[PDB]
Design a protein around this ligand. Structure first.
Ligand SMILES: *[C@H]1O[C@H](CO)[C@@H](O[C@@H]2O[C@H](CO)[C@H](O)[C@H](O)[C@H]2O)[C@H](O)[C@H]1O
Ligand code: NA
Length: 432
């Protein structure tokens, strides 16, 4: 398994949230999420990652005209993350194309600006569940116009690529920004399956990557498969994307996961998903994997077991994870009054954040972490590990490594391992 790396070459294990679905409808493009809310998230779970929702309608409110005041706002929020040691993936988010699909901000449909939305007078009648808007004639049309399946709008993917370039231009020298997730939940309209993914989807990813690389050579470009089918464990037809940057490719794979009998189904679905994800990660060039979206109603029986099974699969796969989502509700870490859900204790586990070498295997319980590293002598920065206070209330006991520092406030343990002695196993336990 492959990993994104920080500037010191350490391999990243990414744990965080999607922040946030409230941005979809916000006039100013921002989530209802404050610097205090991040401090709570950090205090409670020690997260080191966010998938941060941005929008094309906010980037490019008119054709060819980028809103630098919106990018200022995004940059302000990234600043919060940066100050608490987070890595940031920016997600160009849409669902159901645009808020402009009924009488581009919106709570349901969201993403593209009005000027880029061409339903051509075709209906979008109300539906019992929101996902059904996808197949309504005007939405199918909005998408066919975007991918130029109609031949009527070749300019749209060109505007899209250059709106992404405007964003990368602002963030190219931001040390907190590590990834650009190019399109949330790609939907092909009248095109589905590999003819979509190998077709206009890949062709957009290529143009967009290329445009981003005019102004940002180092940020990882993350690509997703088509959402329908692949979310549920079907194989993707996505083809390799070329990274024009000098040296090694920086493309990662950013799939979603949305699966007595109901349990067995869910179990084989995760197995199917892992095998399919691992395949496409190989096709794209043995790329790092980020599980960009997964979540559920935490109040449903069997929820924690499912969450834990997903996170263990992510761990085994070397994947990053951004949970859907930080918004208040029974899916998130906190109910609206601020009360913790079962997710908080479930997620609040020790984990290596930045490893001085390749993590080959690791495990953690609430009062033990074990990690095996494949050495790298060119790395001088220490291995950095998060330890929760419940399980590690004082000092640490470390075997297989020397303690460089133990910050009991930030909860970051830094250790140094031998690089000239093969694979190293570090074990961390609370001091007697
Ligand atoms: C993947 O799946 C998520 C859960 O279904 C989506 O979030 C949902 O989006 C809808 C429509 O916009 C509403 O905002 C829901 O509140 C929200 O949970 C993600 O958008 C999608 O990428
Ligand atoms: Na950066």
């Amino acid at each position: 398994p492959s990993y994104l790396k920080d500037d010191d070459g350490r391999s990243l294990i990414l744990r965080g949230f999607n922040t946030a679905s409230s941005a979809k409808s916000a006039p100013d493009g921002m989530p209802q999420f404050t610097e205090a809310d991040l401090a709570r998230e950090y205090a409670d779970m020690g997260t080191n990652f966010v998938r941060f929702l941005i929008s094309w309608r906010s980037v490019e409110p008119a054709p060819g005209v980028y809103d630098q005041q919106y990018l200022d706002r995004v940059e302000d929020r990234v600043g919060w993350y940066a100050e608490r040691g987070y890595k940031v993936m920016l997600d160009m988010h849409q669902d159901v194309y645009s808020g402009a699909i009924t009488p581009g901000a919106g709570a349901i449909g969201n993403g593209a600006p009005a000027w880029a939305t061409y339903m051509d007078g075709l209906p979008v009648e109300p539906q019992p569940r929101w996902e059904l808007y996808y197949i309504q004639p005007g939405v199918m049309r909005a998408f066919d116009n975007f991918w130029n399946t109609t031949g009527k709008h070749p300019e749209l993917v060109e505007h899209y690529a250059k709106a992404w370039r405007a964003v990368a231009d602002r963030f190219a020298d931001n040390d907190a920004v590590v990834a650009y997730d190019l399109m949330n939940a790609p939907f092909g309209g009248s095109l589905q399956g590999p003819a979509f993914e190998a077709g206009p989807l890949a062709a957009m990813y290529q143009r967009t990557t290329d445009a981003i690389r005019q102004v940002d050579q180092d940020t990882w470009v993350c690509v997703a498969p088509q959402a329908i089918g692949v979310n549920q464990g079907l194989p993707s037809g996505l083809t390799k994307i070329d990274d024009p940057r000098a040296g090694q490719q920086r493309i990662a794979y950013c799939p979603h996961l949305y699966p007595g009998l109901a349990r067995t189904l869910t179990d084989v679905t995760i197995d199917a998903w892992r095998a399919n994800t691992a395949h496409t990660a190989r096709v794209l060039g043995d790329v790092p994997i980020i599980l960009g979206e997964f979540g559920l109603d935490t109040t449903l029986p069997g929820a924690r077991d499912y969450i834990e099974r997903v996170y263990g699969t992510a761990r085994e796969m070397g994947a990053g994870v951004s949970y859907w989502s930080s918004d208040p509700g029974p899916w998130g870490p906190y109910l609206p009054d601020g009360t913790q859900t079962l997710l908080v204790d479930t997620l609040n586990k020790p984990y290596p954040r930045a490893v001085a070498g390749t993590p080959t295997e690791w495990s953690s319980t609430s009062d033990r972490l074990q990690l095996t590293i494949e050495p790298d002598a060119a790395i001088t920065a220490p291995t950095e590990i998060y330890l929760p206070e419940a399980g590690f209330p004082g000092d640490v006991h470390v075997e297989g490594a020397d303690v460089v520092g133990w910050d009991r406030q930030s909860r970051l343990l830094t250790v140094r391992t031998p690089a000239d002695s093969g694979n190293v196993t570090v074990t961390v336990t609370p001091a007697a």
